[PDB]
């Protein structure tokens, strides 16, 4: 008669895209819509029990999150888990929920290894995966003539969730699964000046198609140095792997978009360099229901959660939690509709998998592996104002690249440069 | 009045050096000696509650073990954990026991990261560590004139505990912590012929002082190929990182020792190549109490555990569990003796740390980091019979190499070859 949903997310730290101050109101909105719908779990009272994935310091932890999961499993015996979003939190929790045979739902945990559903059984990912970024890069190379060599630089450390490592891992493995071209990869430490001679030297010895996962400021410093070193768009192309658009403002206002602008004196130099730079991001949901959701999410987060939800691509995470939760209730409803129960994790999970669905994020497809197909945008400046705009979109389900607002991928030469130079890299 | 000891080890699989069929009888012997001693925990009845680190397939698990730990912590509220020995089992459990402020004791879990006791608080390691292998390699290079270049090949995969990876990681980090010479490292898959041209090529391009962590058969094949390709002891030296002496028999009988012998036709050629090869192992405890312990462990394992404990270096693990346990009861006894209690993990732990002790393994030192100093032997053939024997010993607490039975490190040239060739490797 009631269905208990265990949540393991950052319940106090509001810095994460999957923070509760931001996923909480989305989930409250979702539950409110289940009530209104007499076709979704009629009469049931969906209950939410919460546990925090964060440690004493407040960051998501490989230890707090699995402990909180066991605590919720024995205190409340839930039918489904929501979260965690951090990779290091989700991997032990996901391994517990697989052993318990309890379905797990998350719009985070994009790492390559959570992709191994034979281990992460009954884990359904309704947000982005990093292998999906490999899909985009693949379609990008095929649809542009780079069949040989690419270089990948990624900032990395220990102490955070190593997001650039897991992004790059996903790109690297999926790209070599599909193209099997030569992809070099080097890890640098952002705050260490020692690494920037090494990087620049690699940029010119290891590739012309170059992908950088890093903070906006580091990507900007590498562009300024590449310019300073005579590395121009007639021969190089630098993709900033900035999936949440940290280097850009909000797509709702803030017209136009100038990531090279910093007010530091180099804004002229930086815009010259950024002519060779393109920015890869997640795609902003374009459908009208997304904008209505944002308005309601902001209202609910300010009122019941004392949090101010700002615009930006990070909001696709709470939107995807919202949509994934509804997708689950539909599966449970259909499962009950054929004699099943709310604890038939396998039946419920297969109803969600290899299925298309309509949510506040618009079209969303769960693939056969149980991971949502992820759409991507490609930004580019026109030489006119130097402002960056979406010129290409990638539909993750059909694997198609389509031009945007009749824009063209700006090339300093007129066409893309080749991944190998005229002679060798030597 | 009674002290609950929680155990998380492989309770059913007997393949592991820390398997319960082997650590069980050692711990039972230890508890019997606590009884007999009116100076250790007088009148207390020490209780053992067991949980299995192993999964459905029977191998030690990053999931079964932390689940087993939580189960024991809430059902029995123990004062101390024993095990796990597997690295992937011991890392989640060690993070749990640090959070619970419960002391953890293990003669396994030698990985570099377990050494970070700010994370693995109250974890005391009474068996070998892989940073201690770095100490030995350092003392070996200093005491032999190799201050430049070394190459490390290690057989690695996914699916097991990746023991060669963690062995090599510890060697690599500690050696560059102390010598900061150039250490190249390449990983191969043992059953894949693709890698052997790659390995041989690296052997001749990347080092003359070469460490191989691998199965005995792989290490033998590499020597046969090195010989076949003109790589002799006048210019190369191959150390097999074989800590448990898998390539050798038992030090009690089986006189003498011929790792190159296989009865396969190549025994003549293999002995030629093995002249260039030396074998690094853990040191067999030499004290008489160790041999008495073996006799009793063997009896107890056959009678109460239906297991047959064969001779070999793997027995230092249950011997070290035995000694670590008594070391702990001493500390608990001293802690009670100054007003403390059996739940004062910090006080108990600091009593065990930076302390020397006498056990069935003989002299054993827990360093300031809470890890036992590890003694290493070095095997070498004399050209006479081609049999390998200990010729050098390493005392991890004094960090000393001392010649063994007046033997000398056999060199085909008369002295060790230089880590760099006459010209460059080119």
């Amino acid at each position: 008669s009631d269905l208990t949903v265990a949540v393991v997310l950052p319940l106090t730290n509001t810095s994460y895209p999957w923070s509760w101050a931001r996923v909480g109101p989305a989930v409250e909105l979702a539950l409110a819509r289940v009530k209104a719908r007499p076709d979704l779990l009629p009469g049931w009272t969906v209950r939410m029990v919460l546990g925090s994935s964060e440690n004493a310091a407040g960051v998501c932890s490989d230890t707090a999150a699995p402990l909180a999961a066991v605590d919720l499993k024995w205190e409340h015996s839930p039918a489904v888990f929501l979260g965690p979003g951090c990779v290091y939190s989700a991997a032990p929790v996901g391994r517990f929920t697989a052993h318990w045979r309890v379905p797990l739902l998350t719009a985070g945990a994009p790492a390559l290894g959570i992709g191994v559903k034979d281990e992460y059984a009954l884990t359904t990912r309704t947000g982005p995966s990093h292998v999906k970024l490999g899909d985009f890069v693949t379609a990008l190379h095929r649809r542009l003539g780079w069949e040989h060599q690419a270089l990948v630089l990624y900032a990395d450390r220990l102490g955070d969730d190593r997001p650039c490592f897991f992004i790059v891992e996903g790109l690297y493995m999926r790209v070599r699964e599909r193209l099997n071209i030569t992809v070099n990869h080097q890890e640098f430490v952002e705050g260490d000046p020692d690494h920037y001679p090494k990087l620049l030297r690699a940029v010119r010895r290891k590739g012309r198609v170059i992908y950088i996962c890093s903070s906006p400021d580091a990507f900007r410093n590498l562009m300024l140095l590449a310019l300073n070193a005579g590395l121009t768009g007639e021969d190089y192309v630098f993709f900033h792997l900035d999936v949440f658009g940290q280097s850009l403002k909000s797509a709702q206002g803030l017209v136009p978009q100038k990531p090279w602008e910093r007010g530091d004196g180099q804004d002229r130099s930086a815009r010259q360099a950024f002519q060779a730079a393109k920015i890869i991001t997640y795609k902003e949901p374009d459908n009208p229901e997304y904008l209505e959701f944002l308005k309601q999410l902001k209202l609910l987060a300010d009122k019941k959660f004392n949090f101010t939800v700002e615009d930006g691509l990070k909001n696709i995470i709470p939107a995807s939690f919202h949509d994934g939760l509804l997708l689950y209730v539909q599966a449970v409803t259909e499962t009950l509709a054929q004699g099943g129960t709310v604890t038939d994790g396998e039946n419920i999970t297969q109803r969600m998998w290899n299925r298309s669905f309509q949510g506040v994020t618009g079209y969303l497809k769960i693939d056969r592996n149980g991971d949502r197909d992820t759409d991507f945008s490609l930004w580019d400046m026109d030489p006119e104002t130097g402002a960056f705009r979406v010129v290409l979109n990638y539909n993750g389900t059909s694997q198609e690249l389509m031009a945007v607002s009749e824009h063209k991928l700006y090339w300093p030469l007129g066409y893309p440069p080749p991944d190998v130079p005229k002679c060798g890299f030597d | 009045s009674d002290l609950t000891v929680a155990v998380v080890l492989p309770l059913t699989n007997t393949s592991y050096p820390w398997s319960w069929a082997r650590v069980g009888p050692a711990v039972e012997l230890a508890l019997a000696r606590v009884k007999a001693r009116p100076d250790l925990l007088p009148g207390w009845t020490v209780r053992m509650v067991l949980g299995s680190s192993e999964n459905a397939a029977g191998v030690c698990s990053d999931t079964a073990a932390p689940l087993a730990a939580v189960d024991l912590k809430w059902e029995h509220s123990p004062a101390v954990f024993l095990g796990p020995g597997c690295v992937y089992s011991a890392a989640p459990v060690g993070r749990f026991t640090a959070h619970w402020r419960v002391p953890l004791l293990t003669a396994g879990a030698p990985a570099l990261g377990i050494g970070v006791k700010d994370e693995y608080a109250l974890t005391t390691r009474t068996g070998p560590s892989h940073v201690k292998l770095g100490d030995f390699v350092t003392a070996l290079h200093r005491r032999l004139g190799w201050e430049h270049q070394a190459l490390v090949l290690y057989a690695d995969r996914l699916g097991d505990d990746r023991p060669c990876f963690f062995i090599v990681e510890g060697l690599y980090m500690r050696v560059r912590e102390r010598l900061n010479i150039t250490v190249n490292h390449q990983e191969f898959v043992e059953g894949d012929p693709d890698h052997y041209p790659k390995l041989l090529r690296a052997v001749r391009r990347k080092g003359r002082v070469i460490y191989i962590c691998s199965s005995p058969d792989a290490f033998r094949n590499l020597m046969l190929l090195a010989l076949n390709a003109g790589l002799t002891g006048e210019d190369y030296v191959f150390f097999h990182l074989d800590v448990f002496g898998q390539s050798l028999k038992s030090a009690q009988g089986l006189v003498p020792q011929k790792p190159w012998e296989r009865g396969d036709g190549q025994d003549r050629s293999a002995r030629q190549a093995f002249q260039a090869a030396k074998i690094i192992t853990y040191k067999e405890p030499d004290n008489p109490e160790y041999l008495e312990f073996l006799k009793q462990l063997k009896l107890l394992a056959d009678k109460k555990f239906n297991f047959t404990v064969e001779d070999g270096l793997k027995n230092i693990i249950p011997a070290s569990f035995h000694d670590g346990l008594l070391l702990y009861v001493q500390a608990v006894t001293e802690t009670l003796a100054q007003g403390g209690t059996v739940t004062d993990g910090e006080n108990i732990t600091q009593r065990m740390w930076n302390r020397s002790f006498q056990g069935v393994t003989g002299y054993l030192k827990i360093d300031r980091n809470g890890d036992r100093d590890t003694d290493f032997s070095l095997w070498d053939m004399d050209p006479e019979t081609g049999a390998f024997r200990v010729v050098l010993n390493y005392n991890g607490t004094s960090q000393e190499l001392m010649a063994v039975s007046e033997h000398k490190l056999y060199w085909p040239l008369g002295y060790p070859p230089p880590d760099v060739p006459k010209c460059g490797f080119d």
């Binding site: 490989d62 990779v87 290091y88 991997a91 790492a111 390559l112 290894g113 959570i114 992709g115 191994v116 292998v131 990395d156 450390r157 220990l158 190593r162 490592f165 891992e169 690297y172 493995m173 999926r174 070599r176 699964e177 990869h185 080097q186 890890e187 640098f188 430490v189 260490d192 020692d194 690494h195 090494k198 | 990053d62 690295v87 992937y88 890392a91 989640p92 990985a111 570099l112 990261g113 377990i114 970070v116 690695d156 995969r157 996914l158 990746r162 990876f165 090599v168 990681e169 690599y172 980090m173 560059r176 490292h185 990983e187 898959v189």
Partner: peptide, 29 residues
Amino acid sequence: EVKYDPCFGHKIDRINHVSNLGCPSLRDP
């Protein structure tokens, strides 16, 4: 994505990234 690699695909635990041995990098603790 069950392909083998020296750096990528090696479980998710901070124990496998204490040294980034098999991973080309420029750092260490």
